[PDB]
Design a protein around this nucleic acid. Sequence first.
RNA 1: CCGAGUGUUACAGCCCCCCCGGCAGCAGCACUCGCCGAAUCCCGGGGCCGAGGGAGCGAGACCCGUCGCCGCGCUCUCCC
RNA 2: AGAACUGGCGCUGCGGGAUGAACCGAACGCCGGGUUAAGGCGCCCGAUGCCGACGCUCAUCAGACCCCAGAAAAGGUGUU
RNA 3: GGUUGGCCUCGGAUAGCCGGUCCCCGCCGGGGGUCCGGUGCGGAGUGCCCUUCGUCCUGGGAAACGGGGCGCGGCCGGAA
Lengths: 109, 236, 195, 51
Amino acid sequence: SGRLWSKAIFAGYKRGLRNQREHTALLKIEGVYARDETEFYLGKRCAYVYKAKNNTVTPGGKPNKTRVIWGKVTRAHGNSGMVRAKFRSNLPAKAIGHRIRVMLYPSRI
Amino acid sequence: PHCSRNPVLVRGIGRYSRSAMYSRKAMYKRKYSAAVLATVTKPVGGDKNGGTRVVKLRKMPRYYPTEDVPRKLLSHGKKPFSQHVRKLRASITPGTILIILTGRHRGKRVVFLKQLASGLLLVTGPLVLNRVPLRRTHQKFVIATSTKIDISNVKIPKHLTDAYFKKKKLRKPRHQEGEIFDTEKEKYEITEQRKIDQKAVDSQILPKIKAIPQLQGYLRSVFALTNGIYPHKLVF
Amino acid sequence: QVLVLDGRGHLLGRLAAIVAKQVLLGRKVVVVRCEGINISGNFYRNKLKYLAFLRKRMNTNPSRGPYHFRAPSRIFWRTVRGMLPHKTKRGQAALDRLKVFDGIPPPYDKKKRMVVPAALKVVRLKPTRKFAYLGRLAHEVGWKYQAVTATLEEKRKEKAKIHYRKKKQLMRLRKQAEKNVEKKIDKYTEVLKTH
Amino acid sequence: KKNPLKNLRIMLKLNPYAKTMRRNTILRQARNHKLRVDKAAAAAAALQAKS
RNA sequence: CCGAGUGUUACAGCCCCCCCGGCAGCAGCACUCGCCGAAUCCCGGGGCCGAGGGAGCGAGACCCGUCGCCGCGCUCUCCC
RNA sequence: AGAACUGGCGCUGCGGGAUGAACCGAACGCCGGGUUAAGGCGCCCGAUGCCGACGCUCAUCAGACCCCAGAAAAGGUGUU
RNA sequence: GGUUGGCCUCGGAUAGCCGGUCCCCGCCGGGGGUCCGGUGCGGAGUGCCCUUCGUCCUGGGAAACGGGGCGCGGCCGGAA
């Protein structure tokens, strides 16, 4: 019981001005607003929880209608401290603005 | 045998050079110029017969496969898992209150005891503050907390090791009949010996906690980020 | 959930630069009392470039075409309409999360409004240079509802002053009620640790 | 091409003096660290023994 | 009279500047000298991405090349 | 309209100049990581959400970045 | 699609804020001395729920409003 993940929305794709590169997203986690203080979040394992029609889940519990796309923080981005991240899929581009879930794994400190 | 007789200071660089090592060993007065079985016969056990039979064992193959992939290329020494190294973070010492993150427990504050010969580390909240038994957890899936307690002479039991924490099951069926393995319908009762191993290490963690007042409520609680709770604005 | 921006003292574009980014991230921002929005430059200049804005009009019929909104809620709303990519569906649904309200509604008058110190007339302009209200340049052009908008504010600022009197009436006790010496210990733990 | 200057015994395969160039200078910057803790303490605990 | 503030001419009875003989122990340091740096330099720790591809001059080799060059440690002598 | 020296479009995409044959970068197998060029960094739009530095500037027709997209003489007790 | 909610002064910026006897508002508050605090601690960089694991034996502090709610019934309160 209790949330064990820092909040984070999905902000866009790693783009130039015309073309975008789909292979790495970039985020905006809630709370960092400077590059100098995002060093905690490098390497943390982040996940995109969403809903769909069948079931397919992993633990001992029976499958229900949730499925996920895992991923990890690659590096920092910009002076204002947002974070780009490379999932093991590409984001569906529907998730623009809706949150992802940055966990507490990869915890060095 | 002897010890190294060369202290290291950088990994792979000794402190004494090539000429001074020749004096420390004193190799000048120990320089030197000095200096199959396959099997045997079985008995005969035979009449109208002679000759105890052939030296023959580990014979030829009856059957070669059609093709073979060529042999590997040796690449380097790339030693297996029970031979590498053990490493912990510097902020985990015996008695450091940890935080579970990946488990079924998921946040329960526990007490670190000992990092075994596997990289994983045996760690328990005591059984009467949490419902955490003497489980192993991993290094990188737990957050260490800067509050500590001194269990420097806790006298930790010998026979609990990696081998005491393994999981087992054995296959009788390879055949489509209406059992799902026919032994998975069974709660496990190895617990009738782990209990005796618990209160032989649980019973001396409780008086070590009750020196500091607030702590037996602190292990009772669970860790949770809610609203003003920001890590990197949080000294753990 | 929802953030409720107050609108007085703010500049127009400096606010809507911030609002248009916080709405493309998925929040719901509600701009409240957009009537009292300052705008830069003297009043007669801002009136001209909104009077000369009114002639932007397609010549063959104006029923199709440039929809000059006049109320100062839909003045600010058209500004965010410029600074959003509203032709995509990514921008159509960035106007589903903005509802700038003229005056203060009853859903939001018993909320606590927020202010942004990146768009304030206090912080941003040098104090010797003239400004203009979105109040009386929107009334001067078309928006015929200035009287009945300020009339409802004094009914809001009547039931607010009696609330602010009665919250401090409630608050006057918990400094004097805290006076008892009975609860001494639970303040060792907080004067030491950020009371 | 494994990088020289970043792993050892590839410098040494190409430059054998580079190891004894290294443990001649780690000594003169570990003994000079002791010469800046001892001399430092002999002027940090010096006037701390005055007053 | 005390205390503050104006306007004074006035060279020490707050101070500063330039000289002529001195010590402490001096750090490019009490984050302004942040200089330019390194055969005058090395050590440690994170993060990301990848893992591409029958080597036995020797024992007539035998489940099965941890092997080549390189830098190493110990013994085939002793005391402690 | 016509010539001289070099380069380019013509045969050529790509990042930039809002769009563009020739301009500034840079010339192309299929891609993973890294870094930059001309350019930029309030919002469209990746990036100043730096506690940036020192000034100039009120426009009832402000100004805003090569080629490049609307201007001169003369004048102002505007103001530096 | 989401992993707790803030139930509200007005406004000032070369200043505003809190606490306050007296006179003026149908027995409470508009108007002045007086007392505080001010890079805002009567601090949405804060605040209160709160991270309450459940439950028992069993002591101390705190506690005379009990608190879930089909309640049962009255009331007046809030028009943008």
